[model samples]
Target: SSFEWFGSNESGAEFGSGNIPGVEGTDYTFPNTTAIQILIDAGMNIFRVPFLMERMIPTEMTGSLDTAYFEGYSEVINYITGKGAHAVVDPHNFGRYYGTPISSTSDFQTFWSTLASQFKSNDLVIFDTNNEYHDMDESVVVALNQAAIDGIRDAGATTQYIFVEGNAYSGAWTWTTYNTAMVNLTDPSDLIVYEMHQYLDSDGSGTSDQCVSSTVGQERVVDATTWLQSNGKLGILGEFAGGANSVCEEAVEGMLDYLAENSDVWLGASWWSAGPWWQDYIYSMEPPNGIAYESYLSILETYF
Candidate 1:
């Protein structure tokens, strides 16, 4: 399966401020399993479940796992994988610790090693090194990601794929410019998959409801695709979405068409989100009142 996983992010688990280990169900929340089942029934094969790193291992990088948080997180993981789908275990921190950029490479490694050891037994779990890392040194980003890959393998979680994101918020358009050095990233299992996010808005950020053009999606990924092909590496659209409009619809389809056409390197994509909290988010894939977001899913599921 060249296009191995197709799904949307389950986004609620990472909700909270920089205060370490916020109270669950208050400052943060694990995604709804019922909602997860809804998307799974809709033919999605993966769900990027994000959580704050501090909550997993509170206070220090080498700190112990918070029992309550770990249990809540594990329950979600079990639900997704038990249903025979993949769960991307993602730490939603943006290359930072307690709202500050990570300053120690070994500490980051320790975090991954500790976390990976817990989920090492599950073949259905994928390790996403970090969420979008911006406003930092490119070299530091590469080092941090490499450290995570090393730590994951060291923890005996070598069977699953390690999706590594790049700097410049891991955006598809800026990949070749800032992430050209990612080709040197090494992995013992050789399963490192480059993860890039793309949004069809004018600024390439996912905040807006308007799309730049009907073909903007494909247009943004062209350079990253070229870089992937040239470097003999694999990649995935870890996050992507468009509004509920005709132009956005066309743009989403066009980009998916490009990925399917170039299946050699592009594995697949996950839409920006689906969760219980996104009440009116235009790009939310969450089914409201048990009805799928047909306007968006109608375009997304075509390639799934």
Candidate 2:
């Protein structure tokens, strides 16, 4: 119930304080308290922290998470909760997909089990199963997510909300995959939440009217909510973004307005990025390159 308003992406590449360019030692840093504080001051009540747990784990042997990474992450979670904001731990990084040889479902189970146990009693901590599983079969994705749920529960995490995402990049169009595969979840706890990502580009190019049109955009939100409610699941727009176009701004604002008006059903929203991974540069929060940054944040200030 903590996800009533405002959220942002704390990408591991930039917010992790790793050696990636435009991110390393830049304004973006780990335990992103400064950014969290900024959002909170702007009226944000939710923060999604994306982490690369596999990167933190050793390659040779896989049971242990990197101590330093966990410490930094813990500190960040503490800060977020202290600031009166709810936090969701999202395991991002393309290289950490479950069932992969390096990360593996077993390894991820261990990682999540440990995390769930660590923050089992903390109401602000939420567990996101994974970012997105593209090209993966729905059956396999469901199995992996169920394994994660079992691991977390086995580790004594009973209260923390557990979020699961659908395959096909977690896109809204992948409703068929999500609808069919995710219904098998047997967890009676009200802590399970469903997530999906919506993008302006269906073909990975210019913004789609589906994402910008007021009529179509409002329909999209309604459709998503209707589906999730029918399935007994909570819905979250895990990632969304627009470009410099005025249409894009309208789409973003329209979506936010719709969400704000229907906050009771829609859990929350997270912008596509803060630092640049989809765009050309690394940290451009200004015009031409990051126009949506300003407009979206301004809208958040208004509603959040």
Candidate 3:
């Protein structure tokens, strides 16, 4: 999953100048898909593209996803599947719309009710319930995620995988605890991919280039990996990366090596980022100077 969280809706300025049609009034737009193609040529097969809720529905929360929103976003997703890669539709909101933490699941459920139906015919597209839900009750996230799966299934996209993340921002350590609950969820398709994010930097934030140690990240990984082995399920490291810092780079390699060694429980992962906004980020894993692109990719080529 070499996910692209780009531009205004994601983490930066209006992406590629709103090149995507139908979203002219909205800041949401398409960036260069060629960059993503380069990543696919490397070894990636999944692209988790993120979007913003505010931009999609500027009027108000209607508890329904409009056709215009789906139409505007599907162009990007279709392009990914067209290139033979799986596209994951992830609402990049951190468990909320605008500012409030979700108190009811109606708007969230409605978003899927509309979004999933648009892709019910395509199997290459996946659905991530939400991205990095933090500062919310793990219990609430669990219920909301299950409701989202039910909504997607009810909406007729039962064949695609639905990614579920937990509170505490779906951190690998949090996955150690809350994911066990996520495992028990009853899905119509029985295709739930445990999506967790882990970074090697101190405090588990990928923001800093300085890494505490290689083992620190691997140790936390043990929490999710152990659950994966015991449950006989799969996991994806959706957000993890290191910078040019030597220690940090070595630490990333060590973690990837561990994942490769334990492939049974690990499906694969997308590094922290590779998108329009990430040009300034230290952990970007893109092309032509993508972080650690030269010295590390020969190894990633084998693992991802």
Candidate 4:
């Protein structure tokens, strides 16, 4: 496997703000070179660039992708690789019209086939088939991912990893669906990876405290690891967050401990964010009023 772990979610705000502080609704943007460097300095080896394909290509009638969109994507890829880091091109947003699933296989085929053809030569770039798919049947999800894989292959993407997330908020609890879906997938290419986003919560519902119970905390981690090994697929803790005072923090520590014990099976982790909301509410690496962001930074430093 050519993939190495550490990554961060390059939110829209980070892309536009550069190294300077971002103002809400004003200078906030996505895909700035300076921001990518900041993340790399913080121990990230991979950067997940999230975008909505339909938003970038609005017309269903024309069946074409805008050149400007591709240009921006290419710029981001170049910047990420320039920093000696790998990039995962993730289609982050849901479809433009609410409640509409990305049902058209041809549309997905067109999108990925075009994308793969453009970036097949870039070793750092990986493609995530889609983000979260809620309420969609397991078979439907499998079919969609398989179609995208075929599209990329058809377009000449020979070796870049292709990622797929399971339905139902993309958590370990939904492994049954994932297991069912995996049975349908034939190739399981070395370039394919499975990702699950988990949080310290109960049944993926309830208050933040209820969500972070120690027992459930341990259960999710164990379940994800066991299942990944059984399926012979690599697993990534794609998104998670925790603060000093929160149970989520404890859960994160617990997860880290588990990963340490089973380093061979687990790939690595990417913290939920490095932004204000996370810095303030969860763990502040830098806080206002002369408060040092020690608590959060301390936990993160161990991984580095």
| TM-score for each candidate, following the candidate numbering | 0.96, 0.81, 0.86, 0.81
**lDDT comparing candidate 3 with the true structure:** 0.70
Tens digit of lDDT per residue, candidate 1, span 94-206?
A: 88988899878899999999999999989999999999988999889999999999899999998999999999899998998888988889999999999999998988888
Task: Give Cα distance to truth, residue 189, candidate 3, Å.
Answer: 0.5
- Ranking the candidates on lDDT from highest down gives 1, 3, 2, 4
* Poorly placed runs, candidate 4 (over 4 Å): 1-3, 13-28, 94-99, 177-179, 203-211, 275-295
Residue 158 of model 1 has an lDDT of 86
TM value for model 4:
0.81
Worst 10 residues of 4 by lDDT: 283-292
Residue 67 lDDT in candidate 1? 86
Per-residue lDDT tens digits for candidate 2, residues 149-238, read 877887887777787877666776556645457767755465777777776654522244234353334545666666776776677777
**Backbone clash tally (model 3):** 1
Most lDDT-accurate candidate = 1
Model 1, residue pairs in steric clash? none
Candidate 1 whole-model C-alpha lDDT, 0 to 1? 0.87
lDDT of 1 at 274: 85
Question: RMSD of each candidate?
Answer: 1.5, 4.4, 4.5, 5.2
Show model 3 residue runs off by greater than 4 Å. Answer: 1-29, 58-69, 177-179, 292-295
- List lDDT for all candidates, in order: 0.87, 0.63, 0.70, 0.62
TM-score of 2: 0.81
Task: Flag the better candidate by TM-score, 2 or 3.
Answer: 3
